[PDB]
């Protein structure tokens, strides 16, 4: 008896119906491919999906969801979907015309934060490991994320970050 909670709404998109849930995390996509692979190279509409940052989970665990998967998984923080949608509308509404320079600025400044957020998913430095090991022989790692302060470090499955960050791991043990 757990549940989950919406912490923050990152992006928004229209994608293949069904491309939501656990199979949409960066690591699930790097290991088994994106369930939105081809997408919109002509494909029947999409479904408006939202990229969600979950309370108690680092950004690598971010998943795309629909207003329906959210309601189905009965998650807390549903009010956030309402504010996000309203703010998104307020934002779209001041595109009345804007100057092409206003649109130029918007698209640029939105690519900078876009990239910023991507960095929250890559390990900038392993800082400690666990004494206990998984049946597979993997310990868990305490990770420092790029673009985020040390109060954002989190313990992570060792088999998980090994698939992409075996390097920081090697550098961690190398420094001793």
């Amino acid at each position: 008896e757990e549940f989950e909670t919406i912490e923050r709404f990152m992006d928004c998109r229209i994608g293949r119906k069904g491309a939501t849930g656990a199979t949409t995390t960066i690591y699930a996509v790097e290991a088994d491919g994106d369930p939105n692979a081809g997408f919109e190279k002509n494909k029947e509409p999409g479904e408006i999906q939202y990229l969600i940052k979950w309370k108690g989970w680092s950004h690598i665990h971010n998943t795309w969801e629909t207003e329906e998967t959210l309601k189905q998984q009965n998650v807390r923080g549903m009010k956030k979907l309402d504010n996000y949608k309203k703010k998104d509308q307020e934002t779209k509404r001041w595109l009345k015309n804007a100057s092409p320079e206003d649109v130029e600025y918007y698209n640029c400044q939105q690519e900078l934060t876009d990239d910023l957020h991507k960095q929250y998913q890559i390990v900038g430095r392993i800082i400690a490991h666990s004494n206990q090991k998984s049946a597979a022989g993997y310990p868990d790692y305490y990770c420092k994320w790029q673009g985020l302060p040390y109060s954002e470090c989190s313990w992570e499955d060792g088999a998980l970050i090994s698939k992409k960050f075996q390097a920081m791991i090697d550098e961690y043990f190398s420094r001793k």
Partner: peptide, 5 residues
């Protein structure tokens, strides 16, 4: 350490 499961 948990993951999307």
């Amino acid at each position: 350490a948990r993951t999307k499961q």
